Design goal:
It is built from one helix and no strands. By secondary structure, the protein is an all-alpha fold.
Length: 8
C-alpha cells in the first residue's frame, strides 16, 4: 500500500 503507491 505505502500511502497509495508513494507516500511516507
Amino acid at each position: 500500500x505505502x500511502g497509495x503507491x508513494g507516500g511516507c
